[PDB]
Amino acid sequence: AGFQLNEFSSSGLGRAYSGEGAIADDAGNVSRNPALITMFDRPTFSAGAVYIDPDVNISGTSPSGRSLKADNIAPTAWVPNMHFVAPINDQFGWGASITSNYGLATEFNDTYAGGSVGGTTDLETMNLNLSGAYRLNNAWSFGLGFNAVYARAKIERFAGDLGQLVAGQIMQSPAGQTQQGQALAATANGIDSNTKTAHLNGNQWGFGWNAGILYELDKNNRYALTYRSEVKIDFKGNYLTLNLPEMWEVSGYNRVDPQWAIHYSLAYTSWSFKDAYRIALGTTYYYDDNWTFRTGIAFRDSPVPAQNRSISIPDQDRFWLSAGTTYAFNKDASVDVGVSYMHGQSVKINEGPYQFESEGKAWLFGTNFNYAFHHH
Ligand SMILES: CCCCCCCCOCCOCCOCCOCCO
Ligand SMILES: CCCCCCCCOCCOCCOCCOCCO
Ligand SMILES: CCCCCCCCOCCOCCOCCOCCO
Structure with missing residues (x-):
């Protein structure tokens, strides 16, 4: 947040979401690349959630003299996930998931x-996905997915010190000399900061698709290109369209050893004019049958000027640092737990008549449970 989220799995959390389009150790990745469906030879289920605890702080002084300080403006959040993938054929498979790719709260x-x-700015989102995939041969797979997105928005704004600003401008102008001018200033200054200036509530569905290609050099090495379509959501509440942006992603996975794999990715997002990208690299330690270990790093750059920035929507250049671990009870069932630390950069924001600074970070903790059907 973002407002884009990656938290579709706790295993992914532990690898800082690196090459998620090319790894398929559990069912979570089919939501990231429907072509990965062809890596599963038995019905496979996964569920869990990620707890996000952000610490975002605003500082600054208004030209009115009022403090523009605001501590801890982003509340905690739970982001759930569920996934299921199952073969139909030696060539076909399908899958389904419930995820969120987008959300924010200030x-x-x-x-x-x-x-x-x-x-107050509150956007929650729920992605419902159904996917299909086709295996052409031992190397090539293709996946196509359909998405139903449910979005819940809540906005409220207030006057703040605007009337004090207007009072200032009026008093400064020649009109500050007149009796009508003073009165008019006093009327402006007398407007309560907590006057409700705006209010929106809406809940709407939108639709999109997503597709993916898988190329396997062999069972230890594969690459993927994926694409998520934009999804447009018209709130008839009160225009008023919310645009979930396209995403392209290239992923790679190298099992360079029975005990070691690396996985990396480049992901690209444009919207509206203003884009962003993310690079991510991680490594997985297949210690033994029971224990797997997991670590990763990522970086996201969306170079947005400063007069285009919003304090209500924090979007800085950020880093991820992750570790994770999977314990398998047996050949059928396992539990992932992930931790991540997310670090923004102290950034200047010039919005309206105000000049702020904003700095954010977050702690992430996730647990998933995995179960494959049809012993063992
Ligand atoms: C690339 C082709 C796939 C694109 C189609 C997208 C939607 C496909 O969803 C179909 C899911 O329906 C599940 C069918 O249930 C399985 C029935 O057969 C199982 C027998 O083993
Ligand atoms: C009977 C005359 C009494 C004068 C009262 C007029 C209204 C006083 O409120 C003025 C509020 O303005 C705040 C000043 O803002 C800081 C100055 O710099 C801001 C420039 O706009
Ligand atoms: C548009 C192609 C971009 C390729 C980027 C990733 C390629 C990773 O695989 C490279 C090694 O694979 C060996 C090549 O295999 C023989 C020809 O088929 C390759 C087509 O991908």
Whole structure:
């Protein structure tokens, strides 16, 4: 957040989401690349959730003299996931998942000076996916997926100190000399910071598709190109379209040893004019039959000026640092747990009449349970 999320699995969390289009140790990855369906030879289920605990802080002084300070403006969150994939044939398979690829939340007191650009911003999203895949031969697979997205938005803004700003401007102008001018300033200054200035509530569905190609040099090495379509969501509440952006991703996975694999990816996102990319690299330690270990790093760059930035929507250049571990109870069942630390960069924000600074980070903790059907 983002507002884009990667938290589709706890195993992925532990590898900082690196080459997620090319690994297939559990069912979570089919949501990332429907072509991976052909790596599964038996019905496979997975479920869990990621707990996100952000710490995002705003600082600054308004030209009115009011503090623009705001501690801890991003609340914690639970992001659940469920996945299922199952072969139909030696060539065909299918899968289904419930995920969220998008969400954000910021809240300021309704008494905050910068209220007109920072009150309450709440977007929750749920992706429903059905996928199919076709294996052409030993090397090549293709996957196609259909997405139903449910989105719940809540916005409120407030006057903040706007009326104090207007009072300032009026008093400064020649009109500050007149009696009508003073009165008009006083009327503006007298507007409560907590005056509700805006309010939106909406819940809507949108639809999209996604596709993927898998190339396997052999059972230890593979590469993938994936594409997620944009999804548009028209809230008839009150325009008013919310645009979930395209994503392209290239992934690679190298099992360079019975005990070691690496996995990396480049992912690209453009929207609207303003794009972003993410690179990620990680390694997996297949210690033994019971224990697997997991570590990764990532970096995301969306170079957005500063007068295009929002305090209500934090989007900085960020780093991920992750470790994880999978314990398998047997050849059928396992549990993943992931941890990640997410670090933003202190950034300047010039929005409306205000100048802020913003710095954020987050701790992530995830657990998934995996189960494959038809012993063993
Ligand atoms: C590349 C072709 C696949 C693209 C189609 C996308 C939607 C496919 O979803 C179909 C899922 O339906 C599940 C069928 O249930 C299995 C029935 O047969 C199982 C026998 O083993
Ligand atoms: C009977 C005359 C009494 C004068 C009261 C007029 C209204 C006083 O409120 C003024 C509020 O303006 C705040 C000043 O803002 C800081 C100055 O710099 C801001 C430039 O706009
Ligand atoms: C548009 C192609 C971009 C390729 C990037 C990833 C390729 C990784 O595989 C390279 C090694 O594979 C050996 C080549 O295999 C023989 C020809 O088939 C390769 C087509 O991908």
